[model samples]
Target: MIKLRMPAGGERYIDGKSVYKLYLMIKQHMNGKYDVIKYNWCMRVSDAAYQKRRDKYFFQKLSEKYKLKELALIFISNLVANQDAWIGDISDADALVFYREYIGRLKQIKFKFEEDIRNIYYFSKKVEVSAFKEIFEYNPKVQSSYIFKLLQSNIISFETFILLDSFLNIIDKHDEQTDNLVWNNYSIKLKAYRKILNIDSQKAKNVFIETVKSCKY
Candidate 1:
């Protein structure tokens, strides 16, 4: 139940079109759909110059339909925010190049909930559920393993582990107070596990020990 609200204007287009279009192009290129010629052409153009062209076109339209300067600022802000979220570690020069080309593709399609999940996964390794809950509530579709696999096995540095532990603590505190359906479902699973362990801590420990002794790990 992640709730996504449209940007202030109640329109999908950040500048002139939808942001999903950019994602599609990236997906296509990654999938090797574009031949060498097309890929070369795209690679040849500087990303900054390309984004400028898109901004000009989008602002021109905005100027014709609404307050041009104001809308242009809004568009710029949106792009900046998106860049910070998606490509924050990129060098300034490279980022400008990326932004330009990306903005054009952005004008082509809309982003969905699953798309947001994909975007966040690409941008970050460990996402705190509390921060995520602020943007999108309980969304089962957004699984930790999906992002975890994308990162290297050693991705969870000691600092990250501490942060994750803190996040889990907060979630536990919240869960204790909330009677939400999702939490209730999780509770059911925990209760079942406890019961299966025979409701005795010693017996459960022995069972676990035997089970592990039989494993190949």
Candidate 2:
């Protein structure tokens, strides 16, 4: 059984009632074998805030109700995990729960594999050479260029582009404010690349070139 815990209303930086509304929407959409619960962790807040809230009575009550021996916390927003926490198994329960629930929900999407592969390629194209090499040490399955060709032909809507753009914007905001390294690297170049691709502007191309130059070790 998979336990999917929603981020609490305070965690969403919204009022409590709104958070409950969001929970109801999620539950209604995801009514099935999956166990969905809510907890008071804000998606926009820091991990410290999330961890602190995880210990509160509301989360405990949800956990008890679900008979949840282990859990994975699901943030509606795309917040990356800290490497230390990810490596240390500190968020393993949440990660597992989130992964399962995500996979389950992803199955409902109309353009699943195409969207997934486009995302994988978009990020794969953005990483530094060394970082990419280290991460994909084993030869990975390459996304077919044919898929991109199909997307460009308008056989598909390229919805992944919009999704990726939204992700880039959120991480860019986080990086600009916090100077977080992962977000900094992941988002900075993509901003320029996205602009160049979208606007057909020489200035945007120049911005992309400068951003890439700045990424040098």
Candidate 3:
């Protein structure tokens, strides 16, 4: 919803290029498959919305070679879920790069599992709901060993303390791609560990426990 391909009036100034040119790229690439996504330009940027998207953020952005994709996501995720985003002072060229980079960076962002996505999937299969909820917080890679030991050396929640077998079998069914464009150098690893690395080490557990103990819920 970063209105990049709309408003056929003035030329957007961005390093000597124009937003219209980029819009053609979008049309060529998507090839009308995702057509009918047009909306008005930022001709009516509201006062409150304008304040939020300008100046302070502009200088902060200029402070570094920022990613257009990051800004694009913040703009869209908050808006595109329903309809067009009421952007603030978002010029034509800015919108174009935002749209382009949004796609460019999207293919880079990955879905990497920390422990194993199915650890909980199968764990919920065998165990009662009451027990699994409390165990949800533990990093199954490290805590799996303990969780496995708790069941008299039988793996329940995490079927195998070793996930290599399932990991490979599932991987073969599809494919892989890694471009390393995680936001602010932090990877949002879902269902388990993302930024908390090497949870396979017990010392990491102690650090996490100590850190969480300091915070009250």
Candidate 4:
């Protein structure tokens, strides 16, 4: 059981499971009532900035109240789930922008579970888990564009191959022509920047496959 300091100047005890259940109850109610219905008519009814700020305040206070109780992770998961319901069909690229805007604020706080939340963030952005996990090892500090810069500058380094391998993994997972088109654009850019573009893009895949084959799981 966990202890909660009641706002009215008392203490109460509850189990971790019950706390999560309560979060679910609140999430279900909010999602049903405030969902966008996938349109502007209901979506634009309120000032977005106002609502965003309110959500920020609400989560901030809730985190403070439950941080010590080990409920912060549940709250973070709830926030992610709530946003998922608020914006149904997150696979759309446009929905991803709003998803980032809505919950991205959490990244600034010291939540201790940022790694756990990062998977959700990356998944919402359509980043393959395999690729995203590799990124954590390669360089989590830079954005993809910057990674492209590093790859271009190095041209033939192992680090470049690792990053390229990650991108290729994501590209393979993405069957959509539009998704492939983005990679095509990158290839074109790389070709333009480096005149001698002789390296096979799949070479990274070969390296990854070899590494996995050589490792004992």
Name the best candidate (by TM-score): 3
Which model, 1 or 4, shows the larger lDDT?
4
In angstroms, the error of model 1 at 42 is 36
Per-residue accuracy of model 4 over 1-217 as CA lDDT, tens digit each: 0111111211333443334343443333233433211221123222353344323433344334553223423432333333353334222223324434534433432221222233333442455444434532323243233333333454233223333434354322322323344334444333221221123445444544444444323
Misplaced by over 4 Å in model 3 are: 1-44, 48-64, 74-116, 129-217
Q: RMSD in Å for candidate 4, one decimal?
A: 18.2
- Per residue, candidate 2 scores C-alpha lDDT tens digits across 1-217 of 1122333332223333333333333322232212233333222334454445443443433444331112222322112222232223322335344545555543443344344444444555655434422322222233222223334354432233333333234324334455444434434333322321223234333433344344432
RMSD of candidate 1 to the true fold? 19.9
Task: In angstroms, give how far residue 155 of model 3 lies from its true place.
Answer: 19
Q: lDDT for each of the candidates?
A: 0.33, 0.34, 0.30, 0.34
Model 2's C-alpha root-mean-square deviation from the true structure amounts to: 17.5
In terms of lDDT, model 2 sits at: 0.34
lDDT of 2 at 92: 33
Error in Å for residue 36 of model 2: 22
Q: Report the poorest 10 consecutive residues by lDDT, candidate 4.
A: 1-10
Checking candidate 3 for backbone clashes, the offending pairs are none
Candidates in order, TM-scores: namely 0.18, 0.22, 0.23, 0.20
